[PDB]
From a paper:
The eukaryotic 26S proteasome is a large multi-enzyme complex that functions as the primary degradation machinery for the selective turnover of aberrant or unneeded proteins within the cell. Docked on one side of the base is the lid subcomplex, which contains the deubiquitinating enzyme (DUB) [name] that cleaves polyubiquitin chains from targeted substrates as an essential step in proteasomal substrate processing. The lid is an asymmetric, ~370 kDa complex that consists of 9 unique subunits ([name], 5, 6, 7, 8, 9, 11, 12, [name]) and exhibits a characteristic hand-shaped organization similar to that of the eukaryotic initiation factor 3 (eIF3) and the COP9 signalosome (CSN). [name] is an [name]-Pad1 N-terminal (MPN)-domain containing metalloprotease of the JAB1/MPN/MOV34 (JAMM) family and forms a heterodimer with an enzymatically inactive MPN-subunit, [name].
We found that the six PCI winged-helix domains associate into a continuous 18-stranded β-sheet, forming an incomplete right-handed spiral at the center of the lid sub-complex. The C-terminal helices of all lid subunits (except [name]) assemble into a well-defined helical bundle that is centrally positioned within the lid sub-complex, adjacent to the PCI horseshoe and the MPN heterodimer. Notably, within the isolated lid, the [name]/[name] heterodimer is positioned in a previously unobserved orientation relative to the other subunits, stably associated within the palm of the hand-shaped complex via two primary interfaces with the tetratricopeptide repeat (TPR) domain of [name] and the α-solenoid of [name]. Importantly, the N-terminal region of α-helix 13 in [name] (residues 275–285) is nestled against the end of [name]’s catalytic groove, with several residues from [name] directly contacting loops that surround [name]’s catalytic Zn2+ ion. Although [name] Asn275 is not within range to directly bind the catalytic Zn2+ (~5 Å from the Zn2+ to Nδ1 of Asn275), the cryo-EM density in the [name] active site shows connectivity between Asn275 and the catalytic Zn2+, potentially corresponding to a coordinated water molecule. While the Sst2 structure presents a snapshot of the transient substrate cleavage product prior to its departure from the active site, the positioning of [name] Asn275 establishes a stable tetrahedral coordination of the Zn2+ ion via this catalytic water molecule, inhibiting isopeptidase activity of [name] in the isolated lid sub-complex. Interestingly, in the context of the isolated lid, the Ins-1 loop appears to be locked in this closed state through interactions with the neighboring [name] subunit. The combined effects of the tetrahedral coordination of the catalytic Zn2+ by Asn275, the steric hindrance imposed by [name]’s α-helix 13 in the [name] catalytic groove, and the obstruction of the DUB active site by the Ins-1 loop result in robust DUB inhibition.
Author numbering:
A (entry chain C): 218 to 431
B (entry chain D): 216 to 424
C (entry chain F): 263 to 393
D (entry chain B): 298 to 440
E (entry chain G): 24 to 159, 186 to 306
F (entry chain E): 3 to 141, 151 to 239, 259 to 307
The structure:
């Protein structure tokens, strides 16, 4: 009744209200039968950490890795992963985050929610790093964004497409020369646009006027 | 659903898409049918941010999903759109053409008018972030050969339904669309003269009469 | 520039305090020269060459000369290297001796004439509109 | 001379700095220690770079990545790294036209804002010539 | 929805002290009253002396403060301390964390107290940069994270304004004056959008008017005005305002240069 | 010592006003405070002011009271702020002088040095402009009248501007009227340019002594000439942008006029129709 509410709050993305449930719901299966519930107290520690990993707070993650509380029994595939992914996030080194999407996935592939929020978080990380690498530049040959962000171009411009198209940074990609242009504001002018509407409405009104021919 | 029974989707957009809040099935049809309708019209006339708003986010369609033999297909199309999956777009497009459209007694009549449109959108959506891009990039993406791709764009371009234009010599595609004040200048000049010559024309007629 | 450059040659041997600090005097000249060549010029802009020949300074320093001319407050403005221009937003008001006034009289005569022609030229056009 | 050296806006020229202040710096116990505090001498170099690159942003409207490297005694990877830094903190406004060309330091101003500038210039002008009028009458009376 | 109203004397004393302290930052206190949840009104300001350290908590001087308080009492200026000004010359308008802690030291006096950042140097004869806001370019510091922005307006008495009028005597200079351009951008825009708006109204009157008699039409439309007259009307202001607008600049460029 | 022209910043105006309506002082009484600025040179630059509590002796005051302790308590509490604003003189907002004025100025000679300046702010404004009037006291000992001005320092330039943005006039006069007002203004400028030219002649010829204060202002006139983000294309883009609105507006007139032709032609058709019978 708790951790499920923590789950729904991982659906509504509030992770403080979430950990509110995950902590206690961990404590229960902690002190309880332990027969098969070593694993059901092994489950919630994860989401407890998903909360923090989403919340950027690695101090409380240090707090979560302490031998007796969990590790003493629970040192296992779970902890190395979510740690490395966590400070991997706060360092914002995408190659690291990727490698931790490689060698830790033995759980991540199995646990759906975890892996989900890591795909989300991974996105909203790569987004950010992009938004930081472009703004000092215009006409920045896109290979450069690649080697700097340390990732293959094809999915870079794969995303920069998505960002341009999502109105994020206002620029345009020239694939002929392998370039990325950025702009300060929307380049389009509003005034001229309303002119372009007026000409239309008119161009109808004229026809309807001349219909009065009689 | 009448509006849908004719070419007019633009009404069926709001009509159907809000018919999801409440629906009376015993009247005509099942709830998943009308789901497929509101989702099809939605896909068809909805803007990208209001697609995400009103359809991709569905207090309802989520409650259905696999419920039928269509909503999983057509939604498997729409997500492949909104999320920019180009390799997959055409396959799901063909699917829905077969699975949902042609069986629908209302939609089948309109089948082609749908798909033609649903081609354009993607081409449109693919270019919008590019002031130039090379064919083989596109063809590669969609997974068709160039010559057929060129052949397809040639349908839309001269109709000014698509703001591209092609350079075959270099296999390149550049996009002329009205954003930079320049373009919104030229286009305005042309439209203006197009209004003048008309106005003068009728002008002399009513002068002399 | 040149006349000063002549003047220093004699006294520079005479007064030892002048023997030291010749560097200063040189800089200070280059500056004042710059300031004036800007102050007279009708539209204020300069290539780097212009300053070079005017100040007889090889053009690398020319941007050090300009930048230092600003950091003392003498000029405001910007430098465009790509085209090697200097825009000079504005130049400091400074007490003016006799001869320097004359040129001001000139430029002001010009900017009187332009108005002569414009005002006197705008009645003709639009003579049909006046009130 | 050190504090006065970072107050004013002018190019630093690192070597001369190191030469001049080397002895008096190194003598101090906490700041510039024998082997323990040598890590300060890398910072000082950083602050110097940030200083020159901070002032060039003032005067120069455009500059060529070459000449800017020359002025900073750096390399291109370095340069673009420092520009990237400073702009991330919003200390300077500089935008690099990247393909081996040009840093652009002007804050692009909305042309209407350029206008609202030029008007006020005009108005304050006219006010001045007006005063020069009232005076210019007054002196003949006075004289 | 929340806002502050900053009286003229406040703003001028503000910018004066700020411009005077350059290139070091100055601080002072703000005297006013809280109208409702949605408003803070600032009628007065006084200036706080420099400190050896930067603007900070102890920079506020109790002795000085009350010493000023009573001496304003004798003048009837009695008001709460509703906020505190400040200046970040050259750095734009944002609160450093050190600005924040002090802002808290003004939270626990009054929960609605606000922070006002003034920026002397880049505030210039055009737009004046000013900011007021309270806790929870600038986004680097968490504009929305630790704190949040507010809005500002200016109370003006009739007589106040009337003094301000006589500053500039424009009676001779008129006709070379160019009014604010951005304002005629909202003009030349909103005008056009409007013309669009009434275009299809004139369209509906020509179609409906076509198939329905004048006697019937009058009954309907007499309430509002003849959308053909909003075309005939509205086209003008754009026309002549834009022709004087063009000509004025064409003259200022060639004549003044 | 001897000074001539008196300069005033707008903040003493607004300040003194807020003193008036702050203290609710009705016209039969007056408001009083002191003035800080620069008295040294042969003009007097006023900048700042602050309010002074005082009392007048019932009706027809024989005595009065000013608090000198309030003064010497406030003054140094200003000096801690901007030290360069020195106590100069006082002011009463009463529209016209009082008997004790000349008496109390003699008091302020204690707290200032040269010639304590007394100016009168007009808080009613009901008359025409220059609500100030500047006075000193010279021997006998009456008040010499002095000229004044409102000299906006840069901060007050910015402030007064930003506050008076909205009050700017509509000027509904027809197009011909405006276009006329302009050419009038141009000729005016032309004339003034004459004036300065032949004056400068008189400087290099008539040997009217060099007046620096003017030359400074000429220079300041040059500093403001637009160089002409280049402003040039900044202007071009505008003029294009207006010419658009001019143009499509013209389209709107044209189509309207065409409509009215439709109304004529239809009208004459039905009238001439009826003239049959
Ligand atoms: Zn601060």
């Amino acid at each position: 009744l708790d951790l499920m509410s923590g789950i729904l709050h991982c659906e509504d993305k509030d992770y403080k209200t979430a950990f509110s449930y995950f902590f206690e719901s961990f404590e229960s299966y902690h002190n309880l039968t332990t027969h098969n519930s070593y694993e059901k107290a092994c489950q919630v520690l994860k989401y407890m950490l998903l909360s923090k990993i989403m919340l950027n707070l690695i101090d409380d993650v240090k707090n979560i890795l302490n031998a007796k509380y969990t590790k003493e029994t629970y040192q296992s595939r779970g902890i190395d992963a979510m740690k490395a992914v966590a400070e991997a996030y706060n360092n914002r080194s995408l190659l690291d985050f990727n490698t931790a999407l490689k060698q830790y996935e033995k759980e991540l592939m199995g646990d759906e929610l975890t892996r989900s929020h890591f795909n989300a978080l991974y996105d909203t990380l790569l987004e950010s790093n992009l938004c930081k690498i472009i703004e000092p530049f215009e006409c920045v040959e896109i290979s450069h964004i690649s080697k700097i962000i340390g990732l293959d171009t094809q999915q870079v411009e794969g995303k920069l497409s998505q960002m341009i198209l999502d109105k994020i940074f206002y620029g345009v990609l020239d694939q002929g020369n392998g370039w990325l242009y950025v702009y300060e504001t929307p380049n389009q002018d509003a005034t001229y646009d309303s002119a372009l509407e007026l000409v239309g409405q008119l161009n109808k009104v004229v026809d309807q006027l001349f219909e009065k021919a009689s | 659903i009448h509006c849908l029974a004719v070419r007019n989707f633009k009404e069926a957009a709001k009509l159907l898409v809000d018919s999801l809040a409440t629906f009376t099935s015993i009247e005509l049809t099942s709830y998943e049918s009308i789901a497929t309708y509101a989702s099809v019209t939605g896909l068809f006339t909805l803007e990208r941010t209001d697609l995400k708003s009103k359809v991709i986010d569905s207090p309802e369609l989520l409650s259905l999903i696999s419920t039928t033999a269509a909503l999983q297909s057509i939604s498997s199309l729409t997500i492949s759109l909104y999320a920019s999956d180009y390799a997959s777009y055409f396959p799901y497009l063909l699917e829905t053409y077969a699975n949902v459209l042609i069986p629908c007694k209302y939609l089948n009549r309109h089948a082609d008018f749908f798909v033609r449109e649903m081609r354009r959108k993607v081409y449109a959506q693919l270019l919008e972030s590019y002031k130039t891009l090379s064919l083989k990039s596109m063809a590669s993406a969609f997974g068709v050969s160039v010559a057929f791709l060129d052949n397809d764009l040639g349908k839309f371009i001269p109709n000014k339904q698509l703001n591209c234009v092609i350079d075959r010599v270099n296999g390149i595609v550049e996009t002329n669309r009205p954003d930079n004040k320049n373009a919104q200048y030229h286009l305005l000049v042309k439209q203006g003269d197009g209004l003048l010559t008309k106005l003068q024309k009728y002008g002399a007629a009513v002068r002399l009469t | 520039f040149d006349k000063f450059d002549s003047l220093i040659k004699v006294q520079i041997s005479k007064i030892p305090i002048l023997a030291q600090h010749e560097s200063f005097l040189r800089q200070k000249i280059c500056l004042m020269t710059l300031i004036e060549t800007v102050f007279v010029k009708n539209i204020r802009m300069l290539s780097f060459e212009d300053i070079s020949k005017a100040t007889h300074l090889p053009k690398d320093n020319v941007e050090h000369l300009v930048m230092r001319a600003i950091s003392l407050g003498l000029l405001k403005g910007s430098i465009d290297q790509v085209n090697e221009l200097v825009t000079i937003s504005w130049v400091q008001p400074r007490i003016i001796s006799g001869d320097q006034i004359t040129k001001m009289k000139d430029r002001l005569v010009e900017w009187n004439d332009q108005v002569e022609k414009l005002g006197k030229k705008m009645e003709a056009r639009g003579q049909s509109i006046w009130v | 001379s050190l504090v006065k050296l970072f107050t004013t806006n002018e190019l630093m020229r690192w070597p001369i700095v190191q030469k001049t202040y080397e002895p008096v710096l190194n003598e101090d116990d906490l700041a510039f220690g024998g082997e323990a505090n040598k890590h300060h001498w890398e910072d000082l170099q950083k602050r110097v770079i940030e200083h020159n690159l901070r002032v060039i942003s003032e005067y120069y409207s455009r500059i060529t990545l070459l000449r800017l490297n020359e002025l900073l005694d750096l390399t291109e990877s370095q340069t673009e790294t420092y520009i990237s830094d400073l702009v991330n903190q919003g200390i300077i406004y500089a935008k690099v036209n990247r393909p081996a060309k040009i840093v652009n330091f002007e804050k692009p101003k909305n042309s209407s804002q350029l206008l609202n500038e030029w008007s006020h210039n005009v108005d304050e002008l006219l006010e001045h010539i007006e005063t020069i009028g009232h005076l210019i009458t007054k002196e003949e009376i006075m004289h | 929805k929340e806002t502050v109203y900053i009286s003229s004397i406040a703003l001028l004393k503000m910018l004066k002290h700020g411009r005077a302290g350059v290139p070091m930052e100055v601080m002072g206190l703000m005297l006013g009253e809280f109208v409702d949840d949605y408003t803070v009104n600032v009628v007065d300001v006084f200036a706080m002396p420099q400190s050896g350290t930067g603007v900070s908590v102890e920079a506020v001087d109790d002795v000085f403060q009350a010493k000023m308080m009573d001496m304003l009492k004798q003048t009837g200026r009695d008001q709460m301390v509703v906020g505190w000004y400040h200046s970040h010359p050259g750095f734009g308008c944002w609160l450093s964390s050190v600005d924040v802690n002090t802002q808290k030291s003004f939270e626990q006096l009054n929960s609605r107290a606000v922070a006002v950042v003034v920026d002397p140097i880049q505030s210039v004869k055009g737009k004046v940069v000013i900011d007021a806001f309270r806790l929870i370019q600038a986004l680097i510091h968490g504009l929305n994270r630790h704190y949040y922005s507010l809005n500002i307006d200016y109370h003006k008495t009739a007589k106040e304004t009337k003094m301000l009028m006589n500053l500039h005597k424009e009676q001779w200079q008129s006709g070379l004056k160019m009014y604010d351009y951005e304002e005629k951008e909202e003009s030349n825009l909103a005008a056009t959008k409007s013309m669009v708006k009434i275009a299809e109204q004139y369209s509906k009157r020509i179609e409906e008017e076509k198939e329905l008699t004048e006697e019937e039409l009058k009954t309907r439309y007499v309430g509002r005005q003849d959308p053909k007259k909003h075309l005939s009307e509205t086209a003008d202001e754009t026309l002549e305002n834009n022709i004087v607008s063009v000509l004025t600049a064409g003259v200022n460029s060639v004549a003044i240069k | 010592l001897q000074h001539e022209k008196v300069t005033i910043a707008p903040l003493v105006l607004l300040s003194a006003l807020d003193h008036y309506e702050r203290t609710q002082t009705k016209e039969n009484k007056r408001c009083v405070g002191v003035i800080l600025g620069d008295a040294n040179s042969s003009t007097i630059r006023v900048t700042n002011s602050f309010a002074l509590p005082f009392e007048e002796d019932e009706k027809n005051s024989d005595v009065w009271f000013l608090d000198h302790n309030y003064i010497e308590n406030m003054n140094e509490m200003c000096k801690k702020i901007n030290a360069k604003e020195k106590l100069i003189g006082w002011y009463h907002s009463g529209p016209k002088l009082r008997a004790s004025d000349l008496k109390i100025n003699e008091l302020f000679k204690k707290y200032t040095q040269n010639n304590p300046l007394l100016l009168i702010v007009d808080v009613k404004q009901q008359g025409v402009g220059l609500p100030t009037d500047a006075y000193v006291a010279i021997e006998e000992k009456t008040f010499l009248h002095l000229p004044c001005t409102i000299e906006a320092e840069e901060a007050e330039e910015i402030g007064v501007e930003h506050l008076l943005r909205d009050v700017r006039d509509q000027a509904a006069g027809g197009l011909s009227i405006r276009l006329t007002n302009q050419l009038k203004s141009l000729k005016g400028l032309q004339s003034k340019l004459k004036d300065v030219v032949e004056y400068l002649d008189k400087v290099i010829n008539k040997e009217l002594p060099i007046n620096h204060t003017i030359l400074g202002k000429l220079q300041d006139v040059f500093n403001l000439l637009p160089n002409l983000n280049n402003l040039q294309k900044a202007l071009t883009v505008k003029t294009n942008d207006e010419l658009m609105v001019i143009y499509i507006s013209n389209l709107v007139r044209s189509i309207i006029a065409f409509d009215d032709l439709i109304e004529n032609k239809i009208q004459n058709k039905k009238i001439q129709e009826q003239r049959v019978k």
